[PDB]
Amino acid sequence: ADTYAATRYPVILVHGLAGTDKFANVVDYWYGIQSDLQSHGAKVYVANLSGFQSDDGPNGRGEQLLAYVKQVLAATGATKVNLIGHSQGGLTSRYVAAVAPQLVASVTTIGTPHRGSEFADFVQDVLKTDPTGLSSTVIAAFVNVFGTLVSSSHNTDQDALAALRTLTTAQTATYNRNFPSAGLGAPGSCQTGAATETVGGSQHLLYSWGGTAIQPTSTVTGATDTSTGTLDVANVTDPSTLALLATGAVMINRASGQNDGLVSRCSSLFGQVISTSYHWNHLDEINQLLGVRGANAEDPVAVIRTHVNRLKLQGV
Ligand SMILES: [Ca+2]
Numbered sequence: 001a002d003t004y005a006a007t008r009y010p011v012i013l014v015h016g017l018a019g020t021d022k023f024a025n026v027v028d029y030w031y032g033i034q035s036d037l038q039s040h041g042a043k044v045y046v047a048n049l050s051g052f053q054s055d056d057g058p059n060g061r062g063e064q065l066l067a068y069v070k071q072v073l074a075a076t077g078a079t080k081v082n083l084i085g086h087s088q089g090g091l092t093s094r095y096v097a098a099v100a101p102q103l104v105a106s107v108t109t110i111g112t113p114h115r116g117s118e119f120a121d122f123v124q125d126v127l128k129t130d131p132t133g134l135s136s137t138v139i140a141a142f143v144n145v146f147g148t149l150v151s152s153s154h155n156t157d158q159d160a161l162a163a164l165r166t167l168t169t170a171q172t173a174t175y176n177r178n179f180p181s182a183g184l185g186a187p188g189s190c191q192t193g194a195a196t197e198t199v200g201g202s203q204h205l206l207y208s209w210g211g212t213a214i215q216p217t218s219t220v221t222g223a224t225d226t227s228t229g230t231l232d233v234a235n236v237t238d239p240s241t242l243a244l245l246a247t248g249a250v251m252i253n254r255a256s257g258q259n260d261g262l263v264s265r266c267s268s269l270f271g272q273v274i275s276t277s278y279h280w281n282h283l284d285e286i287n288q289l290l291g292v293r294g295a296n297a298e299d300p301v302a303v304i305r306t307h308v309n310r311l312k313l314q315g316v
Contacts, residue, residue, distance in 0.1 A: 005308040006041030009080045009105045009316050010072055014065060016087025016112075018163040019050040023149040023288070030086075031287040036301050042308055045072050045081075047089070052162040054171065055088070055095050056178065062095030069096055069103055080105040082311055084304075086286050087111055087262070088166060090208070090270070091175065098179045101200035105316040107183070107271070108207040108307065111260050111285045114176070114184060115267040116169030118254040119247045123164050133161060138246045145243040149289075167262075181206075183271035190257075190266035192273050205314055206271020207307070211260035211280025213297070214248030223249035227279045228294030238292035244281035260285065274307065 015021055015029040022029060030046065037044050047068050055062040069081055082105050085093040090112025097104045113120070119142075126136055133139040143157050150156035165171065176184065182197040183206035197204050213227035225245040228234055234241050244261025256264040260282040268276065279296040283289060287300045 001039050001041065003041035005037050005305060005312065007043075007082060007308060007312045007316055009082050010043040010045055010076055010078055011037065011082045011084060011308060011311075012045045012047055012065075012069065012072065014047045014083055014085035014089035014093050015049065016085065016089040016092075018146075018150045018153070018159050019052075020151045021046045021048040022151045025151040027290065029286065031289075031291055032301060033287060033304055036305060037308055040305060040308070043076070047092075049089075049092065052159075052165055054166055054175065055092050056175070061088070061092045062099070065092050066096050066100055069100070073103065079103070080316075082106045082108070082308075082316055084108045084307075085110065085112060087113070087282065088163075090114065091166070091172070094179055094181060097197075097199070097204055098181070101202040101204070104202070104204055106205035106207065106311060106314075109268070109270050110208070111210045111263045111268055111280075111282055112208065112270065113167050113172060113263040113267045114270050116172040117164065117167040117262050117267065118169070118251040118256040118259075118264065119262050120164040120167040121169050122250050122254060123161060124168055124170075127161075138250050141243050141246050145239045148239075181270075183208075185269060190269070192269040192271065195272040205311070205316060207274060208268060208270035208272070209274040209278065209303070209307075210263060210265060210268035210276045211278045211282065211285055212258040212265050212276055213279050213281045213284070213294070214245060214252070214259050214261055216252045216258065220245050220249045223252045225281070225294070227281055227284060227297040229296065232294050234292050234294040234297075238283075238289045240283045240289055241281060241292075241294065244283070248281070278303070
């Protein structure tokens, strides 16, 4: 054990997707990340949140996270925390930094759709005419795969789609207006904002990164998966690999540009962007499923570890 990742303030990992900190009630959402960071001296706490309504609604994920943050502080005697969120967890983290600015030292978002997801938009369009979504082979595939990851549910296939409602372009637009952030860039610029923000007289360090495995091609039509080789085992041992190429292809046909299967490069930009060139799909970002990634995908565990050291070096 060493102190490479020993930050001053505790680290809270904030999940996204359908709910809780587990996939199918048994697999850790942040696969293998907590034990790694702890072996490097970090104090890590993993949030467990629920709900499909907006992050700022009554008893919504935002309020749940805020309550959790206060329990962590009260138990540790620490005065602030470092928030690291994935997918919707980046939106959740934003709520806490906005309503209790004095309790947050930094906000890092990984593959967060700050400006919405074109796939979430597509699903909303289809259910307007096929309340089932199944007339779409892409939706069927998405549901089949992501339905198996839902924890604590009696209708996992339904819940798999429910998790996309808050990620639409329209919903995030509303959220961004009610919860502005210096970390966001100007509208329609596909540029990031400021590296820091001063809120309630508290300074926050702002960071982000995302994956761009899915690239547009002139010829799955119109898209290619750059995370995998020719004959890649990740295409077999991880069912989310081809599922996210399919959803990413839909995104590209909806003018998203390069993406991770659910979040475009432009939508992910927030604060200081470490990189968006990682050859990752949305689940590779969190070492899923079960540590499986394509031959061209970088090590996500190493990437996160290096970032917690980065925080330490910044004094948080
Ligand atoms: Ca994977």
